Amino acid sequence: TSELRICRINKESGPCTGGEELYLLCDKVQKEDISVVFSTASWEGRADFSQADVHRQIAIVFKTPPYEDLEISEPVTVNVFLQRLTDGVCSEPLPFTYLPR
Amino acid sequence: ASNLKIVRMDRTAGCVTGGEEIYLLCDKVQKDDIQIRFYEEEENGGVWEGFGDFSPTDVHRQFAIVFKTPKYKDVNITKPASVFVQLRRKSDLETSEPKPFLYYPEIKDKEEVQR
Structure with missing residues (x-):
């Protein structure tokens, strides 16, 4: 028990191709057991980042994971949430929408 | 140091x-003794400053800060201007080592909002 949560994110939208840094x-x-995850109805993607990229356990610089449908033609909003590696506990999801093109 | x-x-x-x-x-x-000071060595005598806008509610868990850019002095310039940014304590005006920051021109007549 220890409700992990996300205070805010520097961006609310990015290219559906992913690789963007937030x-x-x-x-x-x-910094060891923790990982950012983007999810939808039938999809889940783990964002890319290294242990070093976690700042004093209060922030994490990571790169958005490429979306599943790299060809959508409409703003696909998904869920962004933390999630320890051990117990699998998450965090209230945040709204992050992928962009077409 | x-x-x-x-x-x-x-x-x-x-x-x-x-x-x-x-x-x-x-x-x-x-959250109440820290500030994001932007400055520039005029080079002749004086200096320029501008402070990042941010409420103490923005200074996350003591090790992060979200803020807004303080409009550069001369808003009218056709060439990028390089300045500096450093953290500073209102109390003892203690100062963090500086980091570079780049100010560049406002989009050619931004008023292209479609009118």
Whole structure:
């Protein structure tokens, strides 16, 4: 027990191709067991980043994971949430929408 | 050699107009004795400053800060202007090592909002 959460994100939309770099402020997280995840109805993607990229357990610089449908032609909003590697516990999801083109 | 230090920044450059979302990952700070001071060595005598806009509610868990860019002095310039940014303590005006920041021209007549 220790509700991990995300205070805010520096961006609300990005290219559906992913690889974009963002920042997120959050409640204490152990740089080891922790991972940002983007999810939808039938899809899940783990964002890319390294242990070093977690700043004093309060923020994490990571790159958005390429979306599943790299050809959508409409703003596909998804869910963004933390999630320890051990117990699988998450965090209230944040709204991040992928962009076409 | 100090107690203050800027570590990361989602952005290192913004418009001369000012008012843009910039995330700064710092060291130890208190939401009410810290400030994002932008400056420039006039080079002749004086100096220029401008402070990032941000409420203490923005200074996340003591090691991060979200703020807005302080409109550069001369909003009218056709060539990028390079300045500096440093954290500073209102109390003892202690100062973090500086980091470079780039100010560039406002889009050719931004008023192209479609009218």
